Amino acid sequence: QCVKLNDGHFMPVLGFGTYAPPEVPRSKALEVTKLAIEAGFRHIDSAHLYNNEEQVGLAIRSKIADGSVKREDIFYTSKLWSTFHRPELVRPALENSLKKAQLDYVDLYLIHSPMSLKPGEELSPTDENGKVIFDIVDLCTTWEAMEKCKDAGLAKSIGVSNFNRRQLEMILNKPGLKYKPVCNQVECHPYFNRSKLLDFCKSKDIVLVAYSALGSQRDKRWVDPNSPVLLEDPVLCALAKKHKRTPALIALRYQLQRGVVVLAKSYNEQRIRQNVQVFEFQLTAEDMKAIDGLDRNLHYFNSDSFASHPNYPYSDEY
Ligand SMILES: NC(=O)c1ccc[n+]([C@@H]2O[C@H](COP(=O)([O-])OP(=O)(O)OC[C@H]3O[C@@H](n4cnc5c(N)ncnc54)[C@H](OP(=O)(O)O)[C@@H]3O)[C@@H](O)[C@H]2O)c1
Ligand SMILES: CCCc1n[nH]c2c1[C@@H](c1cc(OC)c(O)c([N+](=O)[O-])c1)C(C#N)=C(N)O2
């Protein structure tokens, strides 16, 4: 079921990823989120970026209205987009997310990325030459606004996404800090298992939440299509055969036994239901060690433009 956060709240260890590319109809987000809840998902991951908060919130309201769940049975996450890092913009961002989702509070509000962008209403602002426009913001002040969001009872918990150890320390060592981040949501899978960052986070009682745990959606706008397909991995498949499960299930179970909270996106009803089966079996100490050895220092996120961002979390590479 759950893990206790450092603010005394609880996060379910399996979460449902709601993002789908824009070629997919937006109503589909409503339909598949109802499916995920119907299947046993209680943690739902969304964001302003995904442009789907209305539909995900409608799914949540739907399953509350028909009596399948209470609001407090549901752990709902949303994220502050990078055009709203400047501190006076943060609460308005959160209030707009709540208005779109028609919810009174999010269970978790995150800084979506440390890579600040030009303030405004374009989510992807570009210049006359079509290059992305960065902004420069002290994320400590952004965090202070996030803390006020918790105090105002608008977010149950607060945390970050896409921070490295350096950027976590920055918040952690902030003068007059009220709340540490409850989690850090980062790309994490057997080819990028983030063991160093994971050990740091545990040291700080900060939950690590894995995204692209299944190797990503391999959107060729943001991922090199010829990168290895995570779920076609020899070891994962051999393990799949050993446990009579699927590579996806092995990849998911892997994170759970490391103490990583794990996300899984699917827009396919059968795969949504297969994924909750992660709780049906266990991997041995020997199996875990074998998956550890798969690490290739490979993040699927690939973008030349964002790599030159000052706060690009992976800038040590290069
Ligand atoms: N920067 C960030 O904070 C960030 C970045 C990325 C993701 N995230 C969040 O966390 C989630 C991370 O997932 P992701 O979008 O990167 O993709 P993912 O969870 O790694 O899944 C990748 C693909 O795996 C397929 N899949 C799912 N279950 C499967 C199964 N049992 N067997 C085989 N294939 C299966 C899905 O395809 P189908 O739809 O066809 O089933 C999906 O497109 C996102 O949805 C989003 O909520 C956050
Ligand atoms: C604008 C669309 C960007 C996009 N389309 N396909 C992608 C992205 C990247 C992404 C960035 C995110 O917040 C910075 C994010 O939250 C999510 N998400 O939730 O799926 C995805 C990404 C990564 N990592 C990978 N592997 O594929």
Swiss-Prot record:
User: Which pathway does it take part in?
Assistant: Steroid metabolism
Kindly state the tissue distribution recorded for this protein. Expressed in many tissues including adrenal gland, brain, kidney, liver, lung, mammary gland, placenta, small intestine, colon, spleen, prostate and testis. High expression in prostate and mammary gland. In the prostate, higher levels in epithelial cells than in stromal cells. In the brain, expressed in medulla, spinal cord, frontotemporal lobes, thalamus, subthalamic nuclei and amygdala. Weaker expression in the hippocampus, substantia nigra and caudate.
- Site-annotated residues for Involved in ligand recognition and product release: W222, F301
Q: One GO term of the cellular component aspect?
A: extracellular exosome
Q: Where is this site: Lowers pKa of active site Tyr?
A: K79
Name the reported effect of M170I.
Answer: No effect on 17beta-HSD activity
Which parts of the sequence bind NADP(+)? 18-19, 45, 161-162, 185, 211-217, 265-267, 271-275
Q: Which Gene3D superfamilies match?
A: NADP-dependent oxidoreductase domain
What EC number is given for this enzyme? 1.1.1.-, 1.1.1.210, 1.1.1.53, 1.1.1.62
Reported impact of R221Q: Decrease in the retinaldehyde reductase activity. Exhibits changes in both KM and kcat values
- State the compartments where it is located: Cytoplasm
The Gene Ontology biological process annotation of the record reads: cellular response to calcium ion; cellular response to corticosteroid stimulus; cellular response to jasmonic acid stimulus; cellular response to prostaglandin D stimulus; cellular response to prostaglandin stimulus; cellular response to starvation; daunorubicin metabolic process; doxorubicin metabolic process
Q: Active-site positions, per UniProt?
A: Y50
- The residues that hold substrate are H112
User: What is reported on the regulation of this protein's activity?
Assistant: Strongly inhibited by nonsteroidal anti-inflammatory drugs (NSAID) including flufenamic acid and indomethacin. Also inhibited by the flavinoid, rutin, and by selective serotonin inhibitors (SSRIs). The oxidation reaction is inhibited by low micromolar concentrations of NADPH.
Q: What GO annotations for molecular function exist for this entry?
A: 15-hydroxyprostaglandin-D dehydrogenase (NADP+) activity; 5-alpha-androstane-3-beta,17-beta-diol dehydrogenase (NADP+) activity; aldo-keto reductase (NADPH) activity; aldose reductase (NADPH) activity; all-trans-retinol dehydrogenase (NAD+) activity; all-trans-retinol dehydrogenase (NADP+) activity; androstan-3-alpha,17-beta-diol dehydrogenase (NAD+) activity; androsterone dehydrogenase [NAD(P)+] activity
Q: Which UniProt keywords apply?
A: Cytoplasm, Lipid metabolism, NAD, NADP, Oxidoreductase
Impact reported for K70E: No effect on 17beta-HSD activity
UniProt catalytic activity: a 3alpha-hydroxysteroid + NADP(+) = a 3-oxosteroid + NADPH + H(+); a 3alpha-hydroxysteroid + NAD(+) = a 3-oxosteroid + NADH + H(+); prostaglandin F2alpha + NADP(+) = prostaglandin D2 + NADPH + H(+); prostaglandin F2alpha + NADP(+) = prostaglandin H2 + NADPH + H(+)
Q: Where are the residues marked Important for substrate specificity as a site?
A: L49
> What does the record give as the function of this protein?
Cytosolic aldo-keto reductase that catalyzes the NADH and NADPH-dependent reduction of ketosteroids to hydroxysteroids. Acts as a NAD(P)(H)-dependent 3-, 17- and 20-ketosteroid reductase on the steroid nucleus and side chain and regulates the metabolism of androgens, estrogens and progesterone. Displays the ability to catalyze both oxidation and reduction in vitro, but most probably acts as a reductase in vivo since the oxidase activity measured in vitro is inhibited by physiological concentration of NADPH.
Similarity-based family:
Belongs to the aldo/keto reductase family.
Q: Which PANTHER family match?
A: ALDO/KETO REDUCTASE
Give the protein name, as stated in the record. Aldo-keto reductase family 1 member C3
Lineage here is:
Eukaryota, Metazoa, Chordata, Craniata, Vertebrata
- Gene name of the record: AKR1C3
